[PDB]
Amino acid sequence: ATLSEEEIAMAVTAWEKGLESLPPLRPQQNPVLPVAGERNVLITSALPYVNNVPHLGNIIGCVLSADVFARYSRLRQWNTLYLCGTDEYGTATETKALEEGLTPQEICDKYHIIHADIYRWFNISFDIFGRTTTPQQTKITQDIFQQLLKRGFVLQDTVEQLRCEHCARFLADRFVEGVCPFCGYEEARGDQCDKCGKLINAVELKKPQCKVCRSCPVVQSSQHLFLDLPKLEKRLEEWLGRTLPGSDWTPNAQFITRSWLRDGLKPRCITRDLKWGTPVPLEGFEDKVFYVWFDATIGYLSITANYTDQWERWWKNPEQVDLYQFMAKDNVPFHSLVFPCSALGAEDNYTLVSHLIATEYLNYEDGKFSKSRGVGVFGDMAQDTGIPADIWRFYLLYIRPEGQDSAFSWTDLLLKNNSELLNNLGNFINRAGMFVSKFFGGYVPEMVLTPDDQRLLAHVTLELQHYHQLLEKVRIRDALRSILTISRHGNQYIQVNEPWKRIKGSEADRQRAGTVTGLAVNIAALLSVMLQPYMPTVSATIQAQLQLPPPACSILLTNFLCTLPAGHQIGTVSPLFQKLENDQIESLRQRFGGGQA
């Protein structure tokens, strides 16, 4: 395409300015804390439930999406804190621990390691990967509760529940049978009678029976606490009306939030009759814990608290901190309604989310991931495929479900690997490094820019600015395509100039070959940095092959610079990517298809 004279002029000028356009990068901090006058970016990924092995769908929607923005944020020299951790409390944990013959603490410890190992293999750059089963979780949850309680946002009511005294617990509708009080059907459930269709309350059943021990449950009244959401609806919508417009909340999250408010919020129970949970500091609640519906989102705070006692500088500092929250759309109500209401009702100057990033679902082939049916790739099986992490990262991010659902496809993975990585991105960077190493003893040639060279340079800068424009608004999927667009321009540039041929010609031809070569390898250097949020290992590999200086590796400016000036010596080059074969892929497809085992 055609650009203005000034656009080209500005691009060339910035490019020639070279390495000292780079600011002397600040030394890393631990713990990372907000700096006044600078941008401070707080990033959370939704806390995965601990006792389920995560699959690719879980990873792309949360930890991997958050990782890309986190890495980009650091390249922009923003003070970045990316945190996550395992969600561990609840009835599900008690049930699963029983099935595995372990204590709740035991099975949680076991599966936390599994999560941590999986995310470590996928190279997720957490600043903290924590847990919700800590004393700080208890302290911070109880504090927020007290603040809400003393401001009249907590209700207390009695609820009639069936209780199996033999099993010593309150029964869910699932585990209750009885006679229908409407038609006399003898096998009615606690939730509904399948004979007459009537939706009932389990407490209304005649001759109720526990499905487990077959004894007779009794109706007992138990005390529960409720969060008074209707009273908080006003201050919540004030905040939303103030922060939603002009934000980068994903459209699906915005619709979901508004749709809940249209129906009107109701008081929600925040207590449960469990043992495994955060204790409630109130009289008569010694055998009750906080419902994970309420305190799971507080986990973000306690995880940060275990990281630094200065955690309030992040989570109680809205004027300084921009919070990004990544999740799948199911988690949206807890992040757009529940915690904001709790925080706003606490009146403790809490940092609320500025940009809620919610994805749609990643499906597997023509259906769902399923552990029970053995369908789909789960996080712990990825390592065993012979396909490295960055390849998984590339494909998942290439098909990241942003506007609509996406589907993992083995055929598509092979096709996009061979076409975009091998025949495009890899083919450019391989040739750029090869030409330097083969024709110039590993030294970057002198670059004498022709008008055509200046055009390409300017095109690269404009696409780079497009890349920034997108990722600034968390347009992950499209920013990856900007990278591939640059390498596409680069391949076209190399192919039309044929430097590997001209190098065998006149001294004029040889100078052209040198210019093309040096310019190409500088584009290769830029790509390595742009690629870092997406494929961190490949990024490091390229930078090692080109011996790109560390300050150039850790910052991405909005202009295309000459990071590899003439005379710079590169290392030893080697093909970046391996092709994927039909035999290899069909074997993997059959393995995770469900037709086996």
Q: Which is nearer to Zn ion, 169 or 455 (CB)?
A: 169
79-86 vs 128-131, strand pairing mode: parallel
Q: Residue from 9, 35, 113, 183 that binds Zn ion (CB under 5 A)? A: 183
How far from each other are the two terminal CA atoms of the chain, in whole angstroms? 54
Q: Which is nearer to Zn ion, 91 or 125 (CB)?
A: 91
Q: Which is nearer to Zn ion, 180 or 205 (CB)?
A: 180
Q: 489: closest CA among 459, 510, 517, 461?
A: 459
Q: Which is nearer to Zn ion, 25 or 183 (CB)?
A: 183
Which range binds Zn ion by CB under 5 A, 57-65, 187-195, 262-270, 516-524?
187-195
Exposed e or buried b per residue across 423-448, where buried means at least 16 C-beta atoms within 10 angstroms of its C-beta: ebbbbbbbbbbbbbbebbebebbebe
List the strands of the sheet with 169-170, edge to edge.
169-170, 154-164, 218-227, 268-269
CB of 302 to Zn ion, least distance (A): 35
224 in Cβ contact with 235 (< 8 Å): no
CA dihedral 323, 327, 330, 336 (to 10 degrees): 0
Q: Residue from 9, 25, 196, 218 that binds Zn ion (CB under 5 A)? A: 196
Give the C-alpha distances (Å, rounded to integers) separating 548 from 122, 152, 264, 526, 565.
24, 60, 56, 10, 11
Which range binds Zn ion by CB under 5 A, 28-36, 210-218, 245-253, 330-338?
210-218
Q: Which is nearer to Zn ion, 197 or 264 (CB)?
A: 197
Please tell me what DSSP assigns to residue 336: I
Q: How many residues bind Zn ion (CB under 5 A)?
A: 13
CB of 195 to Zn ion, least distance (A): 5
Scan residues 446-505 and list those touching Zn ion (CB under 5 A). Answer: none
Which range binds Zn ion by CB under 5 A, 114-122, 204-212, 372-380, 480-488?
204-212
Which range binds Zn ion by CB under 5 A, 82-90, 155-163, 212-220, 519-527?
212-220
Q: Residue from 32, 64, 193, 321 that binds Zn ion (CB under 5 A)? A: 193
Give start and end residues of each alpha helix (H) in 332-475. 332-333, 339-346, 389-398, 410-416, 426-439, 451-471
Residue partners of 170: CB distance under 8 A and separation at least 6: 161, 162, 163, 164, 220, 222, 273
CB of 222 to Zn ion, least distance (A): 17
293 in Cβ contact with 338 (< 8 Å): yes
CB of 192 to Zn ion, least distance (A): 9
Which range binds Zn ion by CB under 5 A, 124-132, 185-193, 228-236, 517-525?
185-193
Q: Which is nearer to Zn ion, 25 or 196 (CB)?
A: 196
Which range binds Zn ion by CB under 5 A, 194-202, 386-394, 488-496, 498-506?
194-202
Which range binds Zn ion by CB under 5 A, 86-94, 206-214, 312-320, 429-437?
206-214
Scan residues 120-179 and list those touching Zn ion (CB under 5 A). Answer: 164, 166-167
When computed from its CA atoms, the radius of gyration of the chain, rounded to whole angstroms, is: 29
Phi and psi at 323, nearest 5°, equal -90, 125
Q: Residue from 70, 202, 210, 301 that binds Zn ion (CB under 5 A)? A: 210
HSE-CB at 453 with a 13 A cutoff on CA atoms is 20
Q: Which is nearer to Zn ion, 195 or 488 (CB)?
A: 195
Q: Which is nearer to Zn ion, 151 or 195 (CB)?
A: 195
Q: Residue from 195, 368, 473, 489 that binds Zn ion (CB under 5 A)? A: 195
CB of 213 to Zn ion, least distance (A): 3
Q: 581: closest CA among 424, 431, 413?
A: 413
Other beta carbons within 10 angstroms of residue 183's beta carbon come to 12
501 is in an annotated binding site: no
Q: Which is nearer to Zn ion, 185 or 500 (CB)?
A: 185
In degrees, to the nearest 5, what angle opens at C-alpha 481 toward C-alphas 326 and 549? Answer: 85
CB of 176 to Zn ion, least distance (A): 10
CB of 209 to Zn ion, least distance (A): 9
| Token output for 467 | 């890349």
| C-beta pairs of 435-442 under 8 Å, 24+ apart in sequence | 435/499, 435/500, 435/513, 435/517, 435/520, 435/521, 436/517, 436/518, 436/521, 436/570, 436/573, 437/570, 437/572, 437/573, 439/499, 439/500, 439/503, 439/513, 439/517, 440/514, 440/517, 442/569, 442/570, 442/571
Residue matched to tokens 């192919």: 495
Alpha-carbon distance 101 to 241, whole Å? Answer: 50
Q: Which is nearer to Zn ion, 164 or 358 (CB)?
A: 164
Which range binds Zn ion by CB under 5 A, 180-188, 224-232, 419-427, 495-503?
180-188
Q: Residue from 213, 219, 415, 448 that binds Zn ion (CB under 5 A)? A: 213
Q: Residue from 35, 98, 212, 218 that binds Zn ion (CB under 5 A)? A: 212
Alpha-carbon distance 224 to 449, whole Å? Answer: 75
The three state secondary structure string of 39-99 is CEEEEEECCCECCCCCEHHHHHHCHHHHHHHHHHHHHCCCEEEEEEEEECCCHHHHHHHHH
Q: Which is nearer to Zn ion, 182 or 260 (CB)?
A: 182
Which range binds Zn ion by CB under 5 A, 121-129, 208-216, 314-322, 429-437?
208-216
CB of 146 to Zn ion, least distance (A): 36
98: contact with Zn ion by CB under 5 A: no
CB of 158 to Zn ion, least distance (A): 23
Alpha-carbon distance 84 to 116, whole Å? Answer: 10
Q: Which is nearer to Zn ion, 213 or 219 (CB)?
A: 213
Q: After which residues is the chain broken (C to N over 2.5 A)?
A: none
CB of 272 to Zn ion, least distance (A): 18
CB of 211 to Zn ion, least distance (A): 8
Please report, as ranges, the residues that interact with Zn ion according to CB under 5 A. 164, 166-167, 180, 182-183, 185, 193, 195-196, 210, 212-213
Annotated binding residues for ATP, as ranges? 371
Annotated binding residues, as ranges? 371
